[PDB]
Amino acid sequence: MMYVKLISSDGHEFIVKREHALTSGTIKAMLSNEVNFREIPSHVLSKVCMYFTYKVRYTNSSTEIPEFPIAPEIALELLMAANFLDC
Amino acid sequence: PKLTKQMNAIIDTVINYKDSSGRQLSEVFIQLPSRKELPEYYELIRKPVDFKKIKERIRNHKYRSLGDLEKDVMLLCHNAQTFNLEGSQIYEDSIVLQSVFKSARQKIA
């Protein structure tokens, strides 16, 4: 189980499973290890990782799916992040 | 004064409009459902209006601006767009009278 280093505009290291982290359409292009951002802070990046975790685990599975929670202020910050990282 | 003759002739067109396959569209919106009959509706439609409630304000003398009525007519269309769904003819009918109304206003100016 491989893992990649995602780094933000505050040096915040994010080790997330390479398969979970490949769910991004934009990150996928730069793979087929050390990815860096600047428009993206840390509080958004952890939430994007939390979406990555979630997606794989509840995608395709016929079991009932929980509610994804977005903090009001992080919502726009994440709206352009989901735009960029292409969900 | 003259406004009340304009406003009548304006709304009368829409009211008297029979569609492309021969049948009045407006017929539905003329009278809003009864209170106890469709309560479900009213909660969402926090501002209800029927074509008879416009005809009222004209007859009585309320919209002392010709634009004042357009602002009210657009509300009947909004309420109808609000409750009703895109697909159902009730929704696809508000749009007609909404384009058609401004064409009966294009008639005056």
Binding site: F14, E73, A75 | -
Partner: protein, 104 residues
């Protein structure tokens, strides 16, 4: 069932996923993969409570109820440097900025 966690240490954050069933050392073998650091040079924490290496995740609070993928549990990690250990440190995540005046 499962558990999803954020192994937070300073600016570092490691998002793995064990089993409700598993214990403390079992996670350290995962870390001994990501960082490749040995478990004895690893001091696992939760609240500031230094776990075990053979204590079940369900027992220590980690259930399917509180370790959700979109709400992962923070598991802080201290490190050994010359027999003596280090203080547990995690630099917090950047504060979500001001809420827009149309959003308020």
């Amino acid at each position: 069932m499962d558990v999803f966690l954020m192994i937070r240490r300073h600016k570092t954050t490691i998002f793995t996923d064990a089993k409700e069933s598993s214990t403390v050392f079992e996670l350290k073998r995962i870390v001994e993969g990501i960082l490749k650091r040995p478990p004895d040079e690893q001091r696992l924490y939760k609240d500031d409570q230094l776990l075990d290496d053979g204590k079940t995740l369900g027992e220590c609070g980690f259930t399917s109820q509180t370790a959700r993928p979109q709400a992962p549990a923070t598991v802080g990690l201290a490190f050994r440097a010359d027999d003596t250990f280090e203080a547990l440190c995690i630099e917090p995540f950047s504060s979500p900025p001001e809420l827009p005046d149309v959003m308020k």
